[PDB]
Design a protein around this ligand. Structure first.
Ligand code: MG
Ligand code: MG
Ligand code: MG
Ligand code: MG
Ligand code: MG
Ligand code: MG
Ligand code: MG
Ligand code: MG
Ligand code: MG
Ligand code: MG
Ligand code: MG
Ligand code: MG
Ligand code: MG
Ligand code: MG
Ligand code: MG
Ligand code: ZN
Ligand code: ZN
Lengths: 107, 91, 102, 150, 83, 98, 24, 149, 129
RNA sequence: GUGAAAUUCUUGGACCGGCGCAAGACGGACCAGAGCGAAAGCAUUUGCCAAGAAUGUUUUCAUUAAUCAAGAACGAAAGUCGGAGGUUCGAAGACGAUCAGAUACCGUCGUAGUUCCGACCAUAAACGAUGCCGACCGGCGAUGCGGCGGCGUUAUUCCCAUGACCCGCCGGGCAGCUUCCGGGAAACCAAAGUCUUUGGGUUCCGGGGGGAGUAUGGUUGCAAAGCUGAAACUUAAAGGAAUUGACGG
RNA sequence: UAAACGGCGGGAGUAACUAUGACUCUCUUAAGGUAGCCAAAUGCCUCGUCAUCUAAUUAGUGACGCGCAUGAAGGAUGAAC
């Protein structure tokens, strides 16, 4: 839930990255590593939405900075390369304040 | 010695009412007349008084339960669901 | 006679493998037995790439790809000629056919 | 291979050829015996006593340094457990599995493991009754075993 | 090699072989003197210790049990016992 | 880990320390002031639980609410009867820290 | 015939035989 | 007599005069004698409590539901039966619920209900097996049983 | 589990001989194995063998001279009388000019020729030729 | 929708596009000659509950073990019984096509079933058509787990730890390539080898093809059926692996 | 929509002795009576035909089935009464 009452469902994806000098064909993360990565990238999607408004949520998912910091944080478990917030959907909306709509559009 | 091969408690019904109906009523009668462990005093003295009413002989606690069993699986799942919805409702 | 050492499938240390439906006839095939082709095709024909480029409102527009994984029972695979029968010695190799880059 | 598993592992302990006590061990036989007595009073089973003694006090083999095994020392002093350690742990595991099973009726895997554990219990009890460690009339009852462990 | 000398294997293969599969069994573990900084006494610790070894004169941990070998806490010194 | 640890510590209080099982004897020990720990099953009647807690507050002794019931506390004590309240005169095994 | 269909035919015949004998 | 659901005799305090008020609630399954039940808007979600449907979550189920906001319970009263609170809308003060027949009903959010399922379990599971048992069943209800085609 | 230590050792020696190795290592040692190997060594079918002594059952390293054809075992140690020793001999041996049958007797572990020489029977152990 | 059609739905707005709602299934791609489990089998997230192999061990007991008639637990799918649920698919059934006929293959619809809970059944090409325990007998490169040792790259940090790679060693696994180890009728198999140079322990089980897994008896099951299981009579072959030819919608 | 009321067909030819008709033609229906069961408390012809029971049976039972006019929420069984 955002600060202004917008509830969002965020879906993030990441893919394990093979090293440049890697000879092994596959780059598989173990189950505990995957679980730690998932927990990390859930708890660093929560705090970028809980403490800020929908406007500065949208403007920071425009460059997908959330995915970039997720990828930066997860390098200590297993490297990831293609990390994005794959999807977000609106679940509930707060009453449609026309003043909020107009300040989102204009100033 | 063992007195009946399979009828058990529905041996009182004789040859009547049909084998499948006697088999169906057998487990219900067993659960109806079974004594359950009281969850309040810990004794195995909780038995049915009337349909849906289960009384404990020792602590004299009366509970609303199922018709033939002390509690129904429906009611157990309901209690768990209500607990989950209450803990979701509050924070 | 036992035709293949692997019995025509990749199941080695498993009891059961979930089935999938053939993309051609919807036959239930074990997943490790079905012939899989991962086709990555231009979403437009190589004849029409120039027309789409001319009609594009953009200048440096990269045409999208189309990513489809196809599963075949061996019957449809043989009928569609993605796989072919081979000699007794030639059945034993697993190297995929060359891409023919030049 | 394993008794009740299709495993053929080799992880063991390689006792060294030198049975002599190391020269850097300042603990004497009575000192090690007193340490075993203190740990047994604290409640440790002989396996745990040996593990603690090897890890912390630097003694390699209680038998090598004292001439007697840990269970022999405990029985001589008169504080060995009434049940053997391994039988006690098997009964404890069986009680835990039964407690899980009486709530999870669909855990047929747990039922299978319970059968394996109880078979091991009965074979070990047969061995102990043969060796007269256990009373000749000793029997493992699933109903009354829960009060013996934990 | 039909004429490998089984009686006298060199220490390189004698060490690479499994502990049980050696000519004579030899444990791969050992005992170590451990020095905790800020303390004077010396602790004798098993290399593959399964328990957290603690000093009696200081509320400090010396080793943490792992899968194969006890990981010594940083700042601690150690030496072998008689090879 | 807490439940198995308290079960093992109770097992070692038995056979090695002085205890007493039951409501009347527990109250008698508390008012003699020699009960160092009182364990109550969650099955305990609420009035009895409150009264024993008040007695323990008066006697400056600890109360542990066992996460079992009277049947399971009897099993943990190793008896074949239900125990709902119990007291430990002296542990002998560091269940009660000095 | 296919062995499976011979098995099915035999099962049908066996049910008929059981019915005939039970009738007696 | 005549119903399969047990009844719960529950005693309240009169808020306006020194007196005890005895009610005859339909016993939700799980309640026992000596238990405290709580009735009102601020009551919590527990088996046996009575509180308005509008204050209940989107998946809770209820026992003695009011058809109208202010009468006593009217729905899901027969043994083993329950209704489900499906949906709400804070505007218009309406709540959609599912009845034991499977029908969907829109009621006021102020309608009260007992949390839980009514006791009496699967009474219809047991075969009656006897014309005499049917006779004793309907003798406590009304003159309807021996039915001539 | 291993139930016939002598059988395992004899099979190991036979396999190493067939493969052409110069030395063979047999892991479970026993007095019966040492006596069998001593009989074979006195008859010249094997070279010197050395016993590695651990505190457990020792191991044996045998020098194979390359002149062994088979060193099998007769696992059920049948009672062999002097009246049926000839039948055992022409059932197990390639010829009457060579080949030996080792049987454990009251006088010790020894070959059938010495058993007949000192007029005693015993239990069958194995054979080698 | 099909090879082509047609049954069918459609100016009542069918199909298509958009926004929602509801229900029940199903967990794609990642997904592999990869893992786990006694097999059957197991793939959305998170939590709880017990369980487990392998590894490490200078821990403990000290032969407590292997295989096992009788007996016992589990046992895909289909099927049976009771209660919920029933979206899709779809035995039976109906219709349209095809055809000489077409009770089918193809298409439209559709019952039981398919889903969940509880109780039965105990069967599959339940397959590796290949008993378990133990020892020995070639090479090689990989892979999964655990442990051990090493140039270096990388993650933060100030350094080591700890992860991700790289190079090896060890043990237990799924396998693969290769080989005049050897075996085999051969196909092939590092086991289906260590077998006339025949004996490691032990369980089940076959004796030409049919009749026949039939009859009868017994026993289990609600039923369907499961287990045990003949004889008369008939027959000179039936089969396995490979070779050549002929033929192939 | 039939566990609503109810309903659920004919005529010809055809197998290496005859005899039947697996099979094939057509006409027609809303669908052409399926699983079963039968001279049945339901079959006219009829005291049907065959077997058994008797010295002798229009009776009984078992079997057959183009059944005037059997048949499925009722059909067929099956202890006890
Ligand atoms: Mg073929
Ligand atoms: Mg299978
Ligand atoms: Mg009537
Ligand atoms: Mg099934
Ligand atoms: Mg059903
Ligand atoms: Mg359909
Ligand atoms: Mg054997
Ligand atoms: Mg035969
Ligand atoms: Mg209809
Ligand atoms: Mg008919
Ligand atoms: Mg008739
Ligand atoms: Mg008549
Ligand atoms: Mg007469
Ligand atoms: Mg008749
Ligand atoms: Mg007939
Ligand atoms: Zn009670
Ligand atoms: Zn296909």
């Amino acid at each position: 839930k955002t600060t202004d009452g917008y509830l969002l469902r965020l879906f993030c994806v990441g893919f394990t990255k093979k090293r440049n000098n890697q000879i092994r064909k596959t780059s598989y993360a173990q189950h505990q590593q995957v679980r730690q990565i998932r927990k990390k990238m859930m708890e660093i999607m929560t705090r970028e939405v809980q403490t800020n408004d929908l406007k500065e949520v949208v403007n920071k998912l425009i460059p997908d900075s959330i995915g970039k910091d997720i990828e930066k944080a997860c390098q200590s478990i297993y490297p990831l390369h293609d990390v994005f917030v794959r999807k977000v959907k609106m679940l509930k909306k707060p009453k449609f304040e026309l003043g909020k709509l107009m300040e989102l559009h204009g100033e | 010695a063992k007195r009946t091969k399979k009828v058990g408690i529905v041996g009182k019904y004789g040859t009547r009412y049909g084998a499948s109906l006697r088999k169906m009523v057998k487990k219900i009668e067993i659960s109806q007349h079974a004594k359950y462990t009281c969850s309040f005093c810990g004794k195995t003295k909780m038995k049915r008084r009337a349909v849906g009413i289960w009384h404990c002989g020792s602590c004299m606690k009366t509970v609303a339960g199922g018709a033939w069993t002390y509690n129904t699986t429906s009611a157990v799942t309901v209690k768990s669901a209500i607990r989950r919805l209450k803990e979701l409702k509050d924070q | 006679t036992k035709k293949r050492r692997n019995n025509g499938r990749a199941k080695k240390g498993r009891g059961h493998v979930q089935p999938i439906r053939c993309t051609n006839c919807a036959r239930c095939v074990p997943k490790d037995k079905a012939i899989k082709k991962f086709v990555i095709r231009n979403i437009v024909e190589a004849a029409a790439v120039r027309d789409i480029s001319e009609a594009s409102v953009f200048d440096a527009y990269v045409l999208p790809k189309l990513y489809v994984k196809l599963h075949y029972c061996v019957s449809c695979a043989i009928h569609s000629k993605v796989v072919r029968n081979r000699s007794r010695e030639a059945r034993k190799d697993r190297t995929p056919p060359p891409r023919f880059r030049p | 291979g394993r008794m009740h598993a299709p495993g053929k592992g080799l992880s063991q302990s390689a006792l060294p050829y030198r049975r002599s006590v190391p020269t850097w061990l300042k603990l004497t036989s009575d000192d090690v015996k007193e340490q075993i007595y203190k740990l047994a009073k604290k409640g440790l089973t002989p396996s745990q006593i040996g593990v603690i003694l090897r890890d912390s006090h630097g003694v390699a083999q209680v038998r090598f340094v004292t001439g007697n095994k840990i269970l022999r020392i405990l029985k001589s002093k008169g504080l060995a457990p009434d049940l053997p350690e391994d039988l006690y742990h098997l009964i404890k595991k069986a009680v835990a599995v039964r407690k899980h099973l009486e709530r999870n009726r669909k855990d047929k895997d747990a039922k299978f493991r319970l059968i394996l554990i109880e078979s091991r219990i009965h074979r070990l009890a047969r061995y102990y009754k043969t060796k007269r460690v256990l009373p000749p009339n000793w029997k493992y009852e699933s109903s009354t075993a829960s009060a013996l462990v934990a | 090699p039909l004429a490998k000398d089984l009686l006298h294997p060199s220490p390189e293969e004698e060490k690479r072989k499994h502990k049980k599969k050696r000519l004579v069994q030899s444990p791969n573990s050992y005992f170590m003197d451990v020095k905790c900084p800020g303390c004077y006494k010396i602790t004798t610790v098993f290399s593959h210790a399964q328990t957290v070894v603690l000093c009696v004169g200081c509320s400090t941990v010396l080793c943490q049990p792992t899968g194969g070998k006890a990981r010594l806490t940083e700042g601690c010194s150690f030496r072998r016992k008689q090879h | 880990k807490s439940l198995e640890s308290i079960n093992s510590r109770l097992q070692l209080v038995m056979k090695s320390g002085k205890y007493v099982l039951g409501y009347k004897q527990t109250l008698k020990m508390i008012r003699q002031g020699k009960a160092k720990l009182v364990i109550l099953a969650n099955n305990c009647p609420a009035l009895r639980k409150s009264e024993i807690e008040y007695y323990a507050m008066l006697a400056k002794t600890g109360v542990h609410h066992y996460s079992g019931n009277n049947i399971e506390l009897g099993t943990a004590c190793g008896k074949y009867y239900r125990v709902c309240t119990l007291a430990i005169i002296d542990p002998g095994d560091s269940d009660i820290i000095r | 015939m296919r062995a499976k269909w011979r098995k099915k035919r035999m099962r049908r015949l066996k049910r008929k035989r059981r019915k005939m004998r039970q009738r007696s | 007599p005549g119903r399969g659901a047990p009844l719960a005799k529950v005693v309240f305090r009169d808020p306006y005069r020194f007196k005890k008020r005895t009610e005859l609630f339909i016993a939700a399954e799980g309640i026992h004698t000596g238990q405290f039940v709580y009735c009102g808007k601020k009551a919590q979600l527990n088996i046996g409590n009575v509180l308005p449907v509008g204050t209940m979550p989107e998946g809770t189920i209820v026992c003695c539901l009011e058809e109208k906001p202010g009468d006593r319970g009217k729905l899901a009263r027969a043994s083993g039966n329950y209704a489900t609170v499906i949906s709400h809308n804070p505007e218009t003060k309406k709540t959609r619920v599912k009845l034991p027949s499977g029908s969907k009903k829109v009621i006021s959010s102020a309608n009260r209900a007992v949390v839980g399922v009514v006791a009496g379990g699967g009474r219809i599971d047991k075969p009656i097996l006897k014309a005499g048992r049917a006779y004793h069943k309907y003798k406590a209800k009304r003159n309807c049983w021996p039915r001539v085609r | 589990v291993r139930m016939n230590v002598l059988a395992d050792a004899l099979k190991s020696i036979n396999n190493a001989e067939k493969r052409g190795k110069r030395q063979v290592l047999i892991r479970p040692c026993s007095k019966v194995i040492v006596r069998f190997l001593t009989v074979m060594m006195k008859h010249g079918y094997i070279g010197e063998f050395e016993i590695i002594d651990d505190h457990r059952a020792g191991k044996i390293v045998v020098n194979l001279t390359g002149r062994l054809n088979k060193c099998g075992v007769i696992s059920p140690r049948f009672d062999v009388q002097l009246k049926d020793l000839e039948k055992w001999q022409n059932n197990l041996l390639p010829s009457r000019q060579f080949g030996f049958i080792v049987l454990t007797t009251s006088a010790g572990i020894m070959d059938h020729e010495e058993a007949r020489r000192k007029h005693t029977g015993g239990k069958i152990l194995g054979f080698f030729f």
